[PDB]
UniProtKB/Swiss-Prot annotation:
The chain holds residues 922 to 1419 of 3739 of the full protein. Residues 220-394 are annotated as: C2-type beta-ketoacyl reductase 1. It comes from the Bacteria. Homodimer. Pikromycin PKS consists of a combination of multimodular (PikAI and PikAII) and monomodular (PikAIII and PikAIV) polypeptides each coding for a functional synthase subunit which participates in 1 (monomodular) or 2 (multimodular) of the six FAS-like elongation steps required for formation of the polyketide. Module 1, 2, 3, 4, 5, and 6 participating in biosynthesis steps 1, 2, 3, 4, 5, and 6, respectively. The gene is pikAII. This is Pikromycin polyketide synthase component PikAII. Type I modular polyketide synthases (PKSs) catalyze the step-wise condensation of simple carboxylic acid derivatives. Organizationally, type I PKSs are arranged into modules, wherein each module is comprised of a set of catalytic activities that is responsible for a single elongation of the polyketide chain and the appropriate reductive processing of the beta-keto functionality. A minimal elongation module contains an acyl transferase (AT) domain, an acyl-carrier protein (ACP) domain, and a ketosynthase (KS) domain. Involved in the biosynthesis of 12- and 14-membered ring macrolactone antibiotics such as methymycin/neomethymycin and pikromycin/narbomycin, respectively. Component of the pikromycin PKS which catalyzes the biosynthesis of both precursors 10-deoxymethynolide (12-membered ring macrolactone) and narbonolide (14-membered ring macrolactone). The active site is at Y364.
Length: 470
C-alpha cells in the first residue's frame, strides 16, 4: 500500500555479557591530550595500544607510510585499528561546514589502510553522533557523516571493516570500558551506541501506524526548494491541491512560468526565487523576503541529486563537495530559522543511502546522514525538523534501468510520486521526526544486502530476517 513503506531506526538494548595484541589508535595530531584515557582503557582491557598521531590535512600516501611503518614495527600484523579521527570537528580550508577535517581524514584512513596492507578490522569511534531515543540528543551531526560513509565502507571492504561505535556526547571511563567489550568482537554487532545504560545496537524496524495534526497553515507560505525538479514540482502541486494559499518556490541556479500559472489554477499564489542556498547570505535573503502577512509555515527542502563513486576511487575534496550539495543549505536553513525564534516545520529529504548504505553511495550517505542527524538534535524553540529518508522515486535518474534494473532486482520498487507524497503527509501529520519511506521486497533485498557482508541491521524486521540465516 504505503503504510507498509514506513520504517525507522531503533536501538536495541544488549544483554550484559577480552582484548589482546597490538591496537593502532589513530588520533588527529593537535588532539593528543584526549586519547590518553582511550589507550588506558584499551591497555586496561588487555590490548597493547599504539598511538599514531596524524595531520588530518595530510595526504593518503603520508598516512599509508605511517601505517606501513607501524605495521612493520608490529612484525607485519596488528589486531585492530581504532580511529578517533571523527573527533576533529575543525573546518577544512577548501570547504564550507558541515564537512570537517575529521570527515576527510576518516575517508583517507579507509583508503590508506589498504595501501599499507593492514588487514586488521577498522573501528571508527564517534561521540554525540546518534540518538538512541527520547532523551538522548545528537550533539554532533557532523560525526553522523562518518556513520553514513562507514556503513558503505562495510559493504565495500567487508573483510577489513570492524564497525562504528558512538560514545556519549561527553563520554567517561565506564563508557570507554564498554567500548572495549565491543572491540573484542563478542557482541556480534557492528553499529553500537555506548550509553550510561549499557550497549545498544542499531536496527531497522517497521514503523507502522489515527490522530493527525496540521503541519502547514493555509495563510502561511510554504517554501519548496529545488523546484526545477519533478519531485519538488509535485510536492508544490500537492500543497496547492490540499489547500495551501501561498508558495515560495526556490530553484537552483542554472520550474518557472508554466508551473506558477498552474498552481494559481490549483489555488495558490506562488512566486519563484533563484539563489545558491549553500551561501548563508542568500538563504537569509530568501527567508527575509517572505511576507509578514503570510509568515513562513513550512519548508520542504529537496537538495540536488549528486553522483556517487566507490570509496577507494574518490578523495576528500570530492566527498566534501557531495556533503556540501546535500547538507550545507540545510545547515543554514536550520541555523537561520533557529535564530529567528509558531515554529515553522523544516522537512529534509534524505535517502535510504544514509539508513542502510549501498555500494557506491559513500559520499551520498555521508551528506544525507547529516540531515537525519539534524532531526535528532534538541531544539528549544524550533524549527521542528523532520528528516524523511526515501528510496528512489519513479522517473528519477537511478531508476534508469541500468542501475535501475539493479535496484529493482535488489527488490527496491520506485515510488509513485502521488503515493510517496501521501506517505510524506501521513508522517508529518503524525508528528514523525525521522522516518524511512521505502517500497522494499525484503525477500530480495535482505539476501542481496548481506551477500558480501554479514550484519544484524535487519535482524528485527520479520520479512527480512526470515530471508536470512545465522
Amino acid at each position: 500500500v504505503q503504510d507498509s513503506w514506513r520504517y525507522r531506526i531503533d536501538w536495541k538494548r544488549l544483554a550484559v555479557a577480552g582484548l589482546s595484541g597490538r591496537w593502532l589508535v589513530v588520533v588527529p595530531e593537535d588532539r593528543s591530550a584526549e586519547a590518553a584515557p582511550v589507550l588506558a582503557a584499551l591497555s586496561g582491557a588487555g590490548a597493547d595500544p599504539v598511538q599514531l598521531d596524524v595531520s588530518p590535512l595530510g595526504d593518503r600516501q603520508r598516512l599509508a607510510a605511517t601505517l606501513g611503518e607501524a605495521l612493520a614495527a608490529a612484525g607485519g600484523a596488528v589486531d585492530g585499528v581504532l580511529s578517533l579521527l571523527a573527533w576533529d570537528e575543525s573546518a577544512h580550508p577548501g570547504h564550507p561546514a558541515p564537512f570537517t577535517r575529521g570527515t576527510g581524514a576518516t575517508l583517507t584512513l579507509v583508503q590508506a589502510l589498504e595501501d599499507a596492507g593492514v588487514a586488521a578490522p577498522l573501528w571508527c569511534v564517534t561521540h554525540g553522533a546518534v540518538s538512541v531515543g527520547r532523551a538522548d540528543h545528537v550533539t554532533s551531526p557532523a560525526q553522523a557523516m562518518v556513520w553514513g560513509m562507514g556503513r558503505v565502507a562495510a559493504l565495500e571492504h567487508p573483510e577489513r571493516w570492524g564497525g562504528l561505535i558512538d560514545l556519549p556526547s561527553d563520554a567517561d571511563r565506564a563508557a570507554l570500558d564498554r567500548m572495549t567489550t565491543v572491540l573484542a568482537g563478542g557482541t556480534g554487532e557492528d553499529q553500537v551506541a555506548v550509553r550510561a545504560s549499557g550497549l545498544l545496537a542499531r536496527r531497522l524496524v517497521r514503523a507502522s501506524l489515527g490522530t493527525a495534526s496540521p503541519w502547514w497553515q493555509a495563510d502561511g507560505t510554504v517554501l519548496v526548494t529545488g523546484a526545477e525538479e519533478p519531485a519538488a514540482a509535485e510536492a508544490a502541486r500537492r500543497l496547492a491541491r490540499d489547500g495551501a494559499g501561498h508558495l515560495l518556490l526556490h530553484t537552483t541556479p542554472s520550474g518557472l512560468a508554466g508551473l506558477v500559472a498552474e498552481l494559481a489554477d490549483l489555488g495558490a499564489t506562488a512566486t519563484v526565487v533563484t539563489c545558491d542556498l549553500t551561501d548563508a547570505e542568500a538563504a537569509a535573503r530568501l527567508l527575509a523576503g517572505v511576507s509578514d502577512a503570510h509568515p513562513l509555515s513550512a519548508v520542504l527542502h529537496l537538495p540536488p541529486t549528486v553522483d556517487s563513486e566507490p570509496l577507494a576511487a574518490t578523495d576528500a575534496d570530492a566527498l566534501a563537495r557531495v556533503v556540501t550539495a546535500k547538507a550545507t543549505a540545510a545547515l543554514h536553513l536550520d541555523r537561520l530559522l533557529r535564530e529567528a525564534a509558531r515554529p515553522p516545520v523544516l522537512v529534509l529529504f534524505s535517502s535510504v543511502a544514509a539508513i542502510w548504505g549501498g555500494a557506491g553511495q559513500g559520499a551520498y550517505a555521508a551528506g544525507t546522514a547529516f540531515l537525519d542527524a539534524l532531526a535528532g538534535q534538541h531544539r528549544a524553540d524550533g524549527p521542528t525538523v523532520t528528516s524523511v529518508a526515501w528510496s528512489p522515486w519513479e522517473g528519477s535518474r537511478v531508476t534508469e534501468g541500468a542501475t535501475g534494473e539493479r535496484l529493482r532486482r535488489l527488490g527496491l520498487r520506485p515510488l509513485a510520486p502521488a503515493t510517496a507524497l501521501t506517505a510524506l503527509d501521513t508522517a508529518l501529520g503524525h508528528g514523525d521526526t525521522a522516518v524511512t519511506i521505502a517500497d522494499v521486497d525484503w525477500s530480495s533485498f535482505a539476501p542481496g544486502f548481506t551477500t558480501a557482508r554479514p550484519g544484524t541491521l535487519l535482524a528485527d524486521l520479520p520479512e527480512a530476517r526470515r530471508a536470512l540465516d545465522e
